[PDB]
Every structure is written in structure tokens, then in C-alpha cells.
Amino acid sequence: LTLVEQILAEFQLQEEDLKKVMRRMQKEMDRGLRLETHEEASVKMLPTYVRSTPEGSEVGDFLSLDLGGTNFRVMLVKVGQWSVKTKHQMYSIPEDAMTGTAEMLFDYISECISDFLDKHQMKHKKLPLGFTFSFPVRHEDIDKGILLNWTKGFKASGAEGNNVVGLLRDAIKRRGDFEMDVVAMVNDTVATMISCYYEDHQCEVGMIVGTGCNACYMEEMQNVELVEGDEGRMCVNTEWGAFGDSGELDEFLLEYDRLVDESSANPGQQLYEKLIGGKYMGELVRLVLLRLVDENLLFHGEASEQLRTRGAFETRFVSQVESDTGDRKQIYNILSTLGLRPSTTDCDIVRRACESVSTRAAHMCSAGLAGVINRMRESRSVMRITVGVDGSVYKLHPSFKERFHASVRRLTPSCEITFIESEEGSGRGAALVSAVACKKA
Numbered sequence: 258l259t260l261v262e263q264i265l266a267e268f269q270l271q272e273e274d275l276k277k278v279m280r281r282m283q284k285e286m287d288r289g290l291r292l293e294t295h296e297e298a299s300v301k302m303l304p305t306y307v308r309s310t311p312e313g314s315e316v317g318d319f320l321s322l323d324l325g326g327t328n329f330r331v332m333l334v335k336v337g338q339w340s341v342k343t344k345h346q347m348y349s350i351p352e353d354a355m356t357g358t359a360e361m362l363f364d365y366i367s368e369c370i371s372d373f374l375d376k377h378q379m380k381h382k383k384l385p386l387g388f389t390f391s392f393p394v395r396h397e398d399i400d401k402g403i404l405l406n407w408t409k410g411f412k413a414s415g416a417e418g419n420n421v422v423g424l425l426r427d428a429i430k431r432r433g434d435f436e437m438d439v440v441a442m443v444n445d446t447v448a449t450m451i452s453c454y455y456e457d458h459q460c461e462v463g464m465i466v467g468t469g470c471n472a473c474y475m476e477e478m479q480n481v482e483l484v485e486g487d488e489g490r491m492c493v494n495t496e497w498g499a500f501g502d503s504g505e506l507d508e509f510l511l512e513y514d515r516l517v518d519e520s521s522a523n524p525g526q527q528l529y530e531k532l533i534g535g536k537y538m539g540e541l542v543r544l545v546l547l548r549l550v551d552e553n554l555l556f557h558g559e560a561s562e563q564l565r566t567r568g569a570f571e572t573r574f575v576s577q578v579e580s581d582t583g584d585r586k587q588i589y590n591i592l593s594t595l596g597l598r599p600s601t602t603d604c605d606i607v608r609r610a611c612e613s614v615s616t617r618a619a620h621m622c623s624a625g626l627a628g629v630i631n632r633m634r635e636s637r638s639v640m641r642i643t644v645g646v647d648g649s650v651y652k653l654h655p656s657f658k659e660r661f662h663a664s665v666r667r668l669t670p671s672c673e674i675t676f677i678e679s680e681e682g683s684g685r686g687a688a689l690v691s692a693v694a695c696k697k698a
């Protein structure tokens with residue numbers, strides 16, 4: 258074995274390593290659900306106030322917001338023998354509107370809503386609005402929720418500890434250009450699950466593998482100790498990205514993981530997500546390549562100023578390197594632009610490094626989902642379940658979903674799992690929750 262492959266081997270996780278991760282995820286999930294341990298629990302298991310229901314929704318036009326990254330989305334969902342039609346617009350949030358105040362961020366969002374309404378000839382219409390807000394929140398109801406903390410590099414001031422729906426409403430009123438009834442606020446896991454439920458009624462799990470990584474599932478109300486009642490089920494936002502925040506993953510953490518965390522916007526937070534999320538994947542690869550260079554095993558021990566810059570190795574490059582046919586052309590072109598003159602062997606090392614990071618991400622992720630699924634099987638006493646999935650890592654990365662599917666099946670012995678790749682899920686599902694909520698409001 259080459260010294261390179263001896264270093265890459267550190268990413269490997271045995272079936273027993275994954276079973277240990279899965280069991281600990283289940284223990285941490287149990288801790289978040291119980292009133293006695295909820296405050297100390299790293300995995301928060303936050304109640305969403307989205308309850309189980311077999312009823313049809315309200316008919317009409319529903320507006321949707323999807324805030325969870327730099328690219329923000331506004332959707333119009335037309336609900337009408339049910340038919341669900343969508344119209345969207347994408348918006349890139351500038352750095353100044355993501356690092357300033359919450360007011361600045363919500364004013365940018367409102368400006369985009371106004372633009373959407375203009376482009377779709379509906380500035381004079383007062384519509385119900387579903388808001389997908391992909392950050393940890395403590396809900397008081399389906400339409401009231403306090404931001405616990407920012408994740409994925411978001412850092413707008415005056416948002417944490419405040420009602421997110423109130424910040425949205427305040428920004429709309431300050432603008433005075435249009436009117437809207439914010440009827441619902443959901444996590445993107447929740448919106449993905451709801452959106453996929455419309456296609457398949459067996460869907461009771463929502464999972465995101467994009468910039469960040471999280472999961473939601475339909476929990477029995479008696480197990481949801483933070484909401485009074487035992488009748489029916491409620492969707493629970495695990496916020497499993499925070500798994501490992503109380504040492505649960507310390508035995509598995511590599512030097513690359515510590516460095517990624519130390520230089521991140523949230524040191525010591527979202528440690529499990531930092532192993533999987535597309536926000537960190539490219540950076541993990543960069544750090545690995547630099548260790549190989551420093552050990553005189555890659556690029557003749559010489560790295561460019563670009564390769565030595567945090568963020569230079571983009572998560573899309575990881576996906577691109579793995580999509581290479583074998584001629585090493587795609588790999589060469591990524592590395593040439595990065596200011597390197599790589600050999601055929603260097604290109605191959607880069608691919609092996611990308612595969613080591615992405616395979617670990619898929620495996621670590623499968624241990625988490627297996628924990629949720631096996632926990633559901635036990636609560637419901639051969640389990641047939643559908644999991645709704647969204648995110649660029651799962652949808653676009655070569656063989657991420659293949660490795661993840663295989664690994665998750667190995668870990669869930671008496672379960673028959675169906676995966677639904679959600680197209681617009683993260684946004685459409687907020688409008689569907691809004692349409693169901695509207696029955697009462």
C-alpha cells in the first residue's frame with residue numbers, strides 16, 4: 258500500500274463503527290425528546306407543531322419562501338383529484354445582507370417578494386405564506402418560532418432569541434408595498450417530507466443533504482414530552498447536525514475535522530454536519546491534499562497560493578472530480594485553474610482523496626438515518642417507510658446516493674425503505690403546510 262492510501266484509509270468506517278454511531282444517535286434522540294434531558298441534549302428533537310392528518314387542504318394560491326442559504330427562493334403554489342402547480346424565482350443574497358442585521362436580511366427578502374409579485378402580476382394580492390426557515394428554531398406554534406442559533410455560516414445580528422415570523426412580518430410592513438398572511442414556518446426537512454407525502458402517503462421522514470445536513474420524522478405525541486398530548490403524531494426536527502456537540506463523535510474525528518471546525522463561523526457546533534454537509538466537503542478535501550503536499554506525496558510537495566486559501570477547493574469540484582470518465586481531463590482542468598501543474602498520478606490521488614471524504618459523508622449520514630428508521634420500527638412494532646430527500650450533495654454528487662442507499666439498507670435489516678428525490682420540496686412543502694393550516698385560520 259502507498260503512503261497516500263495509508264493516509265486516505267483514516268476516512269474508512271467499519272460496519273461496527275457505523276452501528277456504534279447509529280446507537281448513539283438513537284440515545285441522543287431519546288435525550289432531546291425527554292423534558293429532563295432536553296436542555297442538555299446535543300440533538301434537540303424540536304417539535305414542529307405539524308401534526309398527522311388525512312384531510313385535504315384548502316384550494317388556492319399559496320406563497321412560499323425558502324431561506325436556508327445564499328440562494329433564496331420565492332414560490333407560488335397553486336392547489337386545486339388534487340393538482341399542485343408551482344412558479345418560482347431564485348435570488349442571491351449579497352454578503353452585506355447576510356452579515357449585517359436581521360432587519361437588513363428581512364428587508365432584502367421582502368424586496369425579492371415584491372419583485373416576484375411584480376413579475377407574476379400579483380402585487381395587489383394578499384396571499385397566505387409558508388416560510389421554510391432552515392435553521393434551529395423553538396416553535397410555540399406552526400406560525401411562531403424563536404431562532405435558537407444560526408448555522409451554515411449565517412450571522413445576521415438581532416435574530417437569535419427573536420420570533421422569526423415577527424422579523425418577516427416587520428420587514429413586510431416597513432416596505433408597505435404588498436400584504437401577506439404568514440400562516441406557517443417550517444424547517445426544510447419538514448417541507449421536504451410534506452412535499453414528498455403529497456406523492457407518497459408512506460412518507461413520514463424528511464432528510465436534507467445539501468449545504469447542511471438534517472432530518473425530521475413523524476413522532477408519536479406521547480414521546481414528544483415538550484408538547485402536551487398523546488393522541489396522533491407530530492413532526493420532529495431532530496437538528497441532528499449538532500450530534501457530536503457533546504463529544505459523541507470524538508473517537509471518529511480526524512485532524513481535518515478539527516481544523517474545519519476551528520476556522521468555521523460556529524466552532525464546536527454542528528460537528529456531525531461538518532462531516533457531511535456541502536458547506537464543508539470541499540474544505541475537508543483541501544485540507545487532505547495540503548497534508549499530502551506537506552508530506553511530499555502530492556504535486557512534488559509544492560502547492561499554489563490558491564490551494565493554500567480556505568475555500569479554494571469548492572464542493573462542486575469534489576462532485577466534478579468524481580464525475581471524471583478516467584482520462585483525468587476534468588481533474589486536470591480543476592487543478593490547472595487552481596494554479597497547479599499536476600501529473601497523471603497527482604490527478605488520481607485527488608480523485609481518491611475526494612472519494613474518501615464523500616464515502617465517509619455517505620456512511621456517517623446512513624448511520625444517522627438508520628438510527629431514525631430503526632427507532633420508528635420499534636415505536637410502530639417489516640417496516641415499510643418512504644424518506645423524502647433534498648439537497649445538492651444527495652441529488653448531484655456522483656455515487657453519494659448509491660453509497661448512502663447501500664449503507665442505510667445494511668443498517669436497517671427489517672425495513673423496506675423508499676427514497677423520493679424531492680425536486681422543489683424545500684419550498685413546495687411550506688405552501689402545503691400553509692394550505693392545511695388555513696383550514697382553521
Ligand SMILES: CCOP(=O)(Cc1csc(NC(=O)c2cc(Oc3ccc(S(C)(=O)=O)cc3)cc(O[C@@H](C)COC)c2)n1)OCC
Pocket residue numbers: 306307308309310311312313314336339399451452454455460461475689690691693694695697698
Ligand atoms: C391549524 C391546524 O392545527 P394542527 O393541530 C397543526 C398542523 C397544521 S398543518 C398540519 N399538518 C399538515 O399540514 C400536514 C400536511 C401533509 O401534507 C399534505 C396534506 C394534504 C395535501 S393535499 C393532497 O393537497 O390534500 C398535500 C400535502 C401531511 C401531514 O401529515 C402526514 C405526514 C402524516 O399524516 C398522515 C400533515 N398540522 O392541525 C392538525 C391537522
Ligand SMILES: OC[C@H]1O[C@H](O)[C@H](O)[C@@H](O)[C@@H]1O
Pocket residue numbers: 325390391392393408409444445446465467468469470471472496498530
Ligand atoms: O439545511 C439543512 C439543515 O442545515 C442545518 O443543519 C440547520 O441547522 C437545519 O435547520 C437545516 O435543516
Ligand code: NA
Pocket residue numbers: 478479480481482483484485486487
Ligand atoms: Na406529548
